Amino acid sequence: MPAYHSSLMDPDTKLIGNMALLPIRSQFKGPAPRETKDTDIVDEAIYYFKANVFFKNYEIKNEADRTLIYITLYISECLKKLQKCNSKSQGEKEMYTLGITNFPIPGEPGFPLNAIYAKPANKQEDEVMRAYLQQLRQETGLRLCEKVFDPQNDKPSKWWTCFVKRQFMNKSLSGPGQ
Amino acid sequence: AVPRTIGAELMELVRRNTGLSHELCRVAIGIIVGHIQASVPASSPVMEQVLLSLVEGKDLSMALPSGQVCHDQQRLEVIFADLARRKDDAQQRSWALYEDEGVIRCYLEELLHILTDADPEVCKKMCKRNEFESVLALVAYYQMEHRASLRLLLLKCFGAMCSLDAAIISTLVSSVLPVELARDMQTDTQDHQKLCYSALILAMVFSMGEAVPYAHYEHLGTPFAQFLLNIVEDGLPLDTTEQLPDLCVNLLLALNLHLPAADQNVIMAALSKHANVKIFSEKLLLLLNRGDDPVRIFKHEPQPPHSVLKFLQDVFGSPATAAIFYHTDMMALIDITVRHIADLSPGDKLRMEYLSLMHAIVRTTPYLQHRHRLPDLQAILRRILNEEETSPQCQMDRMIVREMCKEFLVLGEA
Amino acid sequence: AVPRTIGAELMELVRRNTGLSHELCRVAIGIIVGHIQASVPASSPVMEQVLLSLVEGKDLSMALPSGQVCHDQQRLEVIFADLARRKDDAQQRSWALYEDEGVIRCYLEELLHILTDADPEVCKKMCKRNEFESVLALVAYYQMEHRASLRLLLLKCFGAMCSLDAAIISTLVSSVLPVELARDMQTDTQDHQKLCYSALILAMVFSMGEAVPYAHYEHLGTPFAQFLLNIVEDGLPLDTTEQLPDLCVNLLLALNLHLPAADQNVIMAALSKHANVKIFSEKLLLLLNRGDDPVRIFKHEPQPPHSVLKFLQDVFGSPATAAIFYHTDMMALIDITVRHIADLSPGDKLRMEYLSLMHAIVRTTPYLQHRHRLPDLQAILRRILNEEETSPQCQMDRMIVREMCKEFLVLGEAPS
């Protein structure tokens, strides 16, 4: 039963909608503060990913689970692009252009979990979580791009691209409306 | 006055009990009311509007009178549901007990008809339903199935599906299907009928030039290219129609279409390494002579490059593969290029491509050693750089001549 | 009002371009006019749509157009013309020069569709014209054609023609087609598809039981009957469908259907001389048990006798063929017939035939020395003889019981 759940829900950390704005250790611009611990929510998602995709039931403990699950859904999407990439350089350039696309946000149609995320009501909610989710995407893609390419040849490695078919509880951040 | 859906009421009703192909159904409606209104013009206040209601492409096309689901949609739902429900029957798919070939065969051949007799837009709408689950489940079944009879009908379905929409093609290309087809062909050369259809479907999906997973090259790359070259050079004892030679030419041309760069190209390594290719060489020129492109088998909108020109530009990109031609073929290749480059009217996008192919030939073959048709080439290049039209393609042609001429001033008449 | 021929115009004008089967073409027009007659109530009170429906509702049969002949006639005109020429191009049939298999096959492919998707009346009339000229043209061409790829389509065309009218069957019976087919089968056992169609067509052809030229029995005599028994008794390596045994059982029933008696019978003389008829004995009982007639493959109305009852009466007419059956098989035969004689109601044509088959079995088998079902037989013969129904066939049933009991007084004796 117990899939992996987020460790880093500090009571100091602010919420938008139903997602926790955990600090990020990234050079990308964004509203969450700069993380300095070795572990990070994007690294929780990336560390758990291979195990986490096999579980088929997932019980939301808190807003951080609604945050970390979003990363894994996005990792299960970036793997689609970089498996086609001939080189790490191509993938890194590709991944930067992937994450900036306008993915749906909570309750905006085609978003896959309208039952479970409530839409931000106001501009200072909406714009800030867009500015948050964007920098999560930007960092998440780059951290895969550092480790999916085998350094001997920039082959996008068999062991990572094997997972492309295995969508996280059959949920796609692409969204089923397309 | 007429109930304004009547045209969609009738079109379905005739198909339900005639089984007509949809275009023939439309024709049946058009002629029947047409001929009565010709016999009694006083029917026009009804018959004119009945005809006029039929005039729909996708705009209100198959408009629902109220909540109906047309027969083809019902059957597609039922078939894709049951095929999925079999695909995941993990007991039966590996430790068989029930007899199931017959029911599957009936469902597959029913599917194949609906994909070709019914309205294409309905058929599209069911394939693209939930991020192509109907398609991807059927693909995953093909990897898992191993009755040759059932495999053959699945291929026919994939072709009909592939015809519908480039969005379906790009899904099939990205899925596992190409890898299993190439593995099947290299291992099971005995089912000539499956082998021909396999090469056809494999060329169809690659025809759009979509980038594949790098994991595909592991099977699709240089080993598979050598296998195809052996077939086109030597044939197989079981082929009495010689379809495999032609299909393998088209398949090599399809796979090359999406490859970037030049030197590392997995097909070009095969041509370099293969022991005296020659039948492929002269078959390839017979395509260029007519100038057709066998890979453009579908009318889908974002037309990729002309596959033959693309392929030859790759072949001459390096001296190791430029050597494959016999001297008599090389001369005819130059003759055919110098003719098309001179015949093509200015602004045809192809004239850039023939210019580039000639540029490649001169740079990597010993052209200035043999100078065949060199005076005609000078005269035509002298003309093209002096052609006086202003559209971007005319400029692009004019620019390629300049860069080719400065590299090989003899082509300018020095 | 609409021109009163409009529906016969539509019936052809829709086929011209839809390519529909004629029977569906009637439905395809009927449904659209039927629907618009409802969905716009303004169109029914004016005669238009009711008349469009009524003109399709021909007086019993009718499809006469207002003018030129239908597209189906024009194709039969051109097809039967072109084949009729190629038949007699003596410089090309022998000593061939031009390639013509491709063109001929296209003509036969098209012909076979017209015979199966056009109006039966037009096809029937066109074959009948000039006293079956075009039927005999195909037959004479089939005799001299030797490319098996082409022969197979002529078989199919002859099959579709047999369905079309009994008069065409009679022409093919009288022609050279059957006696050529028998020679082919005995000579070229290497094309399983042609063998199956050859057997099927002979069964189709003889299915109306007419007498043949005596010249036919040079081939259709006992050596061919012995050949058919061997095909049923152990078959051929190519028959991976195991399909010839059924077709050949069907064929022997049809071949015998026209012979008048058991003594001269060229089939029964084969069964007598065959070494051992294990499988044929069995398959014949499985058919009798169900009691259907495989030879009535068509609906033609002046139907012949029930073929299997006929064939068994012809088997038992002599002691040499009565030994065909194994003991357990003949026990099951007496049981099957003693059941069917009981269950058939008065006035049925077939009840006489089972009565006649018991008479045959009683008269030529060792029956009264084993008596397998004799109590039950007598109990039925009691009822049959007392039966107070008065139709001619009932009188005939009672008479044949009187013949049977007068010959064998053990029948009709009191119950034990």
UniProtKB/Swiss-Prot annotation, chain A:
Example of a GO biological process term: Arp2/3 complex-mediated actin nucleation
Question: Principal place where this protein is found?
Answer: cytoplasm
Q: Can you tell me which residues the record assigns to a coiled coil?
A: none
User: At which residues is the cross-link Glycyl lysine isopeptide (Lys-Gly) (interchain with G-Cter in SUMO2) found?
Assistant: K14
According to the UniProt record, one GO cellular component term is:
site of double-strand break
Q: Where in the cell is it found?
A: Cytoplasm, Cytoskeleton; Cell projection; Nucleus
Q: What keywords does the record list, in alphabetical order?
A: Acetylation, Actin-binding, Cell projection, Cytoplasm, Cytoskeleton, Isopeptide bond, Nucleus, Phosphoprotein, Ubl conjugation
Gene Ontology molecular function: actin binding
Q: List every position bearing Phosphotyrosine.
A: Y47
Q: Which residues carry this modification: N6-acetyllysine?
A: K56, K61
Please list the disulfide bridges: none
User: What does the UniProt function comment say about this protein?
Assistant: Component of the Arp2/3 complex, a multiprotein complex that mediates actin polymerization upon stimulation by nucleation-promoting factor (NPF). The Arp2/3 complex mediates the formation of branched actin networks in the cytoplasm, providing the force for cell motility. In addition to its role in the cytoplasmic cytoskeleton, the Arp2/3 complex also promotes actin polymerization in the nucleus, thereby regulating gene transcription and repair of damaged DNA.
UniProt lists the family membership as follows: Belongs to the ARPC3 family.
- How does this protein assemble? Component of the Arp2/3 complex composed of ACTR2/ARP2, ACTR3/ARP3, ARPC1B/p41-ARC, ARPC2/p34-ARC, ARPC3/p21-ARC, ARPC4/p20-ARC and ARPC5/p16-ARC.
Q: What is this protein called?
A: Actin-related protein 2/3 complex subunit 3
Native species: Bos taurus (Bovine)
UniProtKB/Swiss-Prot annotation, chain C:
Tell me which tissues or organs this protein is expressed in.
Highest expression in heart, brain, skeletal muscle, kidney and liver. Lower levels in placenta, lung, small intestine and leukocytes. Weak expression in colon, thymus and spleen.
- Signal peptide location in the record? none
Query: What is the predominant subcellular site recorded for this chain?
Result: nucleus
Q: Which GO terms describe its biological process?
A: cytoskeleton organization; endocytosis; positive regulation of neuron projection development; regulation of postsynapse assembly
| Highest taxon in the source lineage | Eukaryota
Instruction: List localization entries.
Output: Nucleus
Complexes and interactors: Associates with the intermediate filaments, vimentin and desmin. Binds the first and third SH3 domains of NCK. Binds the proline-rich domains of N-WASP through its SH3 domain. Similarly, binds diaphanous protein homolog 1 (DRF1). Binds the SH3 domains of GRB2 through its proline-rich domains. Interacts with Helicobacter pylori toxin vacA. Isoform 4 interacts with FHOD1. Interacts with FASLG. Interacts with TMIGD2.
**Function as written in the Swiss-Prot or TrEMBL entry:** Has an important role in stress fiber formation induced by active diaphanous protein homolog 1 (DRF1). Induces microspike formation, in vivo. In vitro, stimulates N-WASP-induced ARP2/3 complex activation in the absence of CDC42. May play an important role in the maintenance of sarcomeres and/or in the assembly of myofibrils into sarcomeres. Implicated in regulation of actin polymerization and cell adhesion. Plays a role in angiogenesis.
Q: Which disease is it linked to?
A: A chromosomal aberration involving NCKIPSD/AF3p21 is found in therapy-related leukemia. Translocation t(3;11)(p21;q23) with KMT2A/MLL1.
Q: What is this protein called?
A: NCK-interacting protein with SH3 domain
Q: Source species, please?
A: Homo sapiens (Human)
Q: What is the lineage of its organism?
A: Eukaryota, Metazoa, Chordata, Craniata, Vertebrata
Report the gene name. Answer: NCKIPSD
Write the span of the intact protein that is present: 307 to 722 of 722
